[PDB]
Ligand binder design. Sequence first.
Ligand SMILES: *[C@@H]1O[C@H](CO)[C@@H](O)[C@H](O)[C@H]1NC(C)=O
Ligand SMILES: *[C@@H]1O[C@H](CO)[C@@H](O)[C@H](O)[C@H]1NC(C)=O
Lengths: 50, 49
Amino acid sequence: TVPQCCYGFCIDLLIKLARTMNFTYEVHLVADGKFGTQERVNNSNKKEWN
Amino acid sequence: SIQQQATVMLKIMQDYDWHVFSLVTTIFPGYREFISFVKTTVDNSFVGW
Ligand SMILES: *[C@@H]1O[C@H](CO)[C@@H](O)[C@H](O)[C@H]1NC(C)=O
Ligand SMILES: *[C@@H]1O[C@H](CO)[C@@H](O)[C@H](O)[C@H]1NC(C)=O
């Protein structure tokens, strides 16, 4: 979990939102590296996202 | 127990293409767990019918 340098349109929008609403940004990348939806895994009994 | 019998009944409902059902229960105290389990399984939508 080394710190990277990610930037672009989304971070600019986030900075605008933080300035307009006193937010503090703690941007962290998703471990799975995917959007994440519903799927079936081992022991298919509980509904969960990724 | 009630939990596993409920799963068997839900598998039976999976078979024969039965998707709409209604719960009719008495004031029997040992069925609130049954109602809760059925509600939780209804909330479970990632698999099943
Ligand atoms: C959120 O909206 C309410 C209603 O307009 C406002 O009073 C409040 O200040 C807003 N939050 C921030 C952090 O400005
Ligand atoms: C943000 O916080 C500072 C100090 O906590 C405060 O003076 C300022 O009014 C806040 N901004 C908003 C929009 O409430």
